[PDB]
């Protein structure tokens, strides 16, 4: 690892006004591990809600997050700090039947 983690972390807040608590995740970060990091956060236990990587959305400034860009293309440029903090909207969106298997 990489000493010192400070990068720019994030938190994710339900759609519900619920909030997870933040993590630091470089801007190199993939938005691929991104909502991969959201599913091992999530409870799997949870019923009606996400849980699989393909039920959570991750919304940003009004953009859904694709997985196929990176933290970065959301990010401010190197001419910020790792103090900033950033929390991010997680909406849910239940699939018609669908989970897990």
């Given at each position: 690892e990489a000493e010192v983690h400070n990068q720019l972390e994030i938190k994710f807040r339900l759609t519900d006004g619920s909030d997870?608590?933040?993590?630091?995740?470089p801007?190199?970060?993939?938005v691929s591990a991104l909502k991969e990091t959201?599913?091992?956060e999530w409870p799997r236990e949870k019923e009606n809600?996400?849980?699989?990587?393909k039920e959570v959305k991750l919304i940003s400034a009004g953009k859904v997050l694709e997985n196929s860009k990176t933290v970065?293309?959301?990010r401010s440029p190197v001419?910020?700090?790792?103090?900033?903090?950033?929390?991010?909207?997680?909406?849910?969106?239940?699939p018609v039947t669908e989970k897990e298997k």
């Open positions: 997870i608590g933040p993590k630091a995740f801007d190199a970060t993939t959201v599913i091992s809600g996400p849980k699989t990587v970065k293309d959301y001419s910020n700090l790792a103090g900033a903090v950033t929390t991010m909207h997680v909406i849910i969106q239940a």
